[PDB]
Design a protein around this nucleic acid. Structure first.
Ligand SMILES: [Zn+2]
Lengths: 220, 50, 64, 51, 377
DNA sequence: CTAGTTGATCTCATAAGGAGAAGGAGCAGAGCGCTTGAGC
């Protein structure tokens, strides 16, 4: 179990064509813990591999522990094709050439951004224009991924959906082989395989192994 | 302030409802030069979004 | 009337809730900081103040 | 926005009592409480006191 | 077992190896009151426990009704399954009783003749153990959520108390003081804990999701405001993601353990403050009050027993693996204490009983009439 | 360019309504993806 390997698999699962090649392929830290049993180390590998500049971990808002992952190169290649042709395309390019390869912190302070990156107080709206700078608070702001709205809406919808059917299942159990074999519900479009990894990481289910494969149960 | 804040996002400060859809397009077409009517329609349509 | 009360144990203002259950002719009042519960037999006429009175009277009676 | 003296004139008494306008009194109240708030927020103050 | 004994008398293994190995084996074999029982005098739920620093024999306890009961924890009888009797109890009839719920109690380090209890009645009381009366009463403007005394400092007797107010209060047993106050927090301070390694180093955890490492001698703010993601570095640098309601230094004081209502637990370096990125899984924590937990001492690998709903979770401190869940209670557990000498655990919860967790795997040898299946044939 | 002088200027110091419009609550039903689910 390697975090380099772990993140790669999730990346493959992503429905790339579903979002018209605009949102870079997000993979969650929750589903990272699914492939690698020892979470204790998964964070440690991704930590140095964060400052290694080959990954971007973006903080999301669907829960307190919402930390998404965006591929660095793909994060780069997609912002220009989204920013260019727009009024905000000006200093977002600077943000890219200066801020991204010099820092890896999840949220930038006011004095940090203005001084270290030499940002004015007028162009800062342009980064807020299309998913570049979120709003942590008055003094700090988390790093944004453009066009993240649609993803989480489907993501949250999907999580609820899978949770619901699992509960509905007779005797409140549902075999994992019975998810893949059965057609994915139309309510969730991110992929049934994508979400089942999420609850495993979120510990909403436990991977109980038996003679008939592995089973998931709500916590007792 | 109440109405505008309820219409816009609390976190990312964006319009809750996509503005390119036919419903908003026809609402805007009807409300040409009527900002009060536009606000009323937008508010009563975006109040249901959670 | 008021529904947020002060817990007699943990001394937190506006930190008590009253549960309404006409069907079971009973009511429950519980805190939020320390979560101390109490149940009393209520009727169609009982009010959230009444369950406080029953609880606080029992507390004083238990303190006797 | 502070109104000028024309909007809130200082009336003249039959003697020399220069009564200020009610808007001027409210403005003075606002300035004193704003200075108190500024000094409180620059120094150490409780959250409930600031509220 | 036998190999550890033989390797000891032969000299191949240093004598500490068997002791640490047998200590950690006892922790793994922890189970309910196989040979014990705690006398029940707390009418309400029990909020705090503390074992005396020396000789680990008498244990204090503080209930939700305000009574504080001092216990006895060794078998003065010949027979087993002894009951842990109470030598004394400060109840309602006492003139100086906590009127309201007592939140945390603590034995004074270096001797057992004095102990301090702080309640929600906005007072910290100094007690005389022998006469069971008070000596100093410290009233506070807001309710008191926790108080800690330095277990290793010998140059001072400062007691640190965190109130509902946004600012730490440092009372000195020597003289009255009660005026030294630490600023830098924004909301209710739910946990304070001194550092067992450094005398003047204090950790304060408050509802603004910030834990601050203070130096009492220092006259200029805090030293380290622990952050979660280790960015470059206040009104920022959140220690957790909710309400930090727990604090427990490790045995040597080199690392810090914190529990918040984000259902997350973190281990932090004591000197620099960087988190060590031990994930611990999900640690259930919905308590709005101070959550008291302990860490094992004198074992092969240190353990941490943290309250987990109606159960107690055991994790390896550094490995961060879930060892076992001690399902004994019926209501939520809020305090757990560790008997270092015997590797035993005492748990206070809200079902008004202190449960003892004693090591198993030692049973009487017969020459069980209740242990059979009764299935029909 | 330099001192010395004169005012400004400040700071600190002791004590027996209404009609209507707007929001929200609660229940009530329609619809629909879903999850079975069992009769021919
Ligand atoms: Zn209470």
């Amino acid at each position: 179990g390697s975090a380099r390997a772990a993140v790669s698999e999730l990346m493959q699962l992503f429905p790339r064509g579903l979002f018209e090649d605009a949102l870079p392929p997000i993979v969650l830290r929750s589903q990272v813990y699914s492939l690698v049993p020892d979470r204790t180390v998964a964070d440690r590998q991704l930590k140095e591999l964060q400052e290694q500049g080959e990954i971007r971990i973006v903080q999301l808002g669907f829960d307190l522990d919402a930390h998404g992952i965006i591929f660095t190169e793909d994060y780069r290649t997609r912002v220009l094709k989204a920013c260019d042709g727009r009024p905000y395309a000006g200093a977002v390019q600077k943000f890219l050439a200066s801020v991204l390869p010099a820092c890896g912190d999840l949220s930038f302070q006011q004095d940090q951004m203005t001084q270290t990156f030499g940002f004015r107080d007028s162009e800062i709206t342009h980064l807020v224009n299309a998913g570049v700078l979120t709003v942590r608070d008055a003094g700090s702001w988390w790093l944004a991924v453009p066009g993240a709205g649609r993803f989480i809406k489907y993501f949250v919808k999907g999580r609820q959906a899978v949770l619901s059917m699992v509960r509905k299942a007779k005797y409140r159990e549902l075999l994992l082989s019975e998810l893949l074999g059965r057609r994915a519900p139309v309510v969730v479009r991110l992929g049934l395989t994508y979400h089942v990894h999420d609850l495993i990481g979120a510990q909403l289910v436990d991977c109980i192994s038996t003679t008939s494969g592995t089973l998931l149960r709500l916590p007792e | 302030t109440m109405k505008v804040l309820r219409c816009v996002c609390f976190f990312c400060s964006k319009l809750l409802v996509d503005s390119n859809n036919p419903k908003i397009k026809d609402i805007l077409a009807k409300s040409k030069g009527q900002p009060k009517k536009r606000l009323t329609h937008v508010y009563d349509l975006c109040k249901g979004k959670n | 009337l008021e529904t947020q009360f002060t817990c007699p144990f943990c001394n937190h203002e506006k930190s008590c809730d009253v549960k309404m259950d006409r069907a079971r002719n009973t009511g429950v009042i519980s805190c939020t900081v320390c979560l101390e519960e109490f149940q009393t037999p209520i009727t169609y006429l009982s009010e959230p103040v009444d369950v406080y009175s029953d609880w606080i009277d029992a507390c004083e009676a238990a303190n006797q | 926005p502070v109104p000028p003296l024309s909007v809130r004139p200082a009336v003249v008494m039959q003697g020399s009592a220069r009564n200020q306008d009610d808007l001027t009194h409210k403005l003075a109240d606002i300035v004193k409480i704003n200075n108190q708030l500024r000094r409180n927020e620059q120094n150490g103050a409780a959250a409930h006191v600031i509220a | 077992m036998l190999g550890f004994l033989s390797a000891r008398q032969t000299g191949l293994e240093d004598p500490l190896r068997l002791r640490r190995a047998e200590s950690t084996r006892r922790v793994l074999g922890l189970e309910l009151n196989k040979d014990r029982d705690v006398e029940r005098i707390h009418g309400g739920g029990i909020n705090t426990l503390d074992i005396e620093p020396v000789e680990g024999r008498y244990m204090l306890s503080g209930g939700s009704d305000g009574v504080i009961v001092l216990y006895d924890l060794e078998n003065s009888s010949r027979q087993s399954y002894y009951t842990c009797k109470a030598v004394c109890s400060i109840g309602r009839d006492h003139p100086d009783v906590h009127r309201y719920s007592v939140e945390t109690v603590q034995w004074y380090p270096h001797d057992t003749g004095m102990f301090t209890s702080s309640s929600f009645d906005k007072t910290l009381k100094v007690w005389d153990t022998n006469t069971l009366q008070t000596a100093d009463v410290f009233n506070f403007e807001e309710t008191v959520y926790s108080h800690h005394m330095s277990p290793v400092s010998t140059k001072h007797c400062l007691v640190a108390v965190g109130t509902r107010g946004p600012k730490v209060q440092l009372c000195d047993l020597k003289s009255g003081s009660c005026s030294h106050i630490l600023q830098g927090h924004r909301q209710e301070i739910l946990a304070v804990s001194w550092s067992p390694r450094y005398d003047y180093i204090l950790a304060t955890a408050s509802a603004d999701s910030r834990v601050k490492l203070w130096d009492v001698r220092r006259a200029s703010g805090c030293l380290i405001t622990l952050d979660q993601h280790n960015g470059k570095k206040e009104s920022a640098n959140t220690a957790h993601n909710g309400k930090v309601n727990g604090l427990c230094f490790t045995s040597d004081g080199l690392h810090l353990l914190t529990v918040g209502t984000d259902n997350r637990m973190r281990l932090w370096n004591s000197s620099n403050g960087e988190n060590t990125l031990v994930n611990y899984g999900k640690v259930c924590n919905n308590s709005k009050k101070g959550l008291k937990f302990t860490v094992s001492c004198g074992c092969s690998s240190e353990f941490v027993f943290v309250p987990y709903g109606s159960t107690i979770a055991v994790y390896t401190v550094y490995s961060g693996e879930q060892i076992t869940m001690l399902k004994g209670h019926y209501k939520t557990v809020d305090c757990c204490v560790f008997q270092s000498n015997f590797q035993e655990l005492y748990s206070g919860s809200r079902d008004c009983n202190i449960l003892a967790w004693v090591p198993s795997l030692y049973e009487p040898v017969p020459d069980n009439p209740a242990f059979e299946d009764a299935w029909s044939s």
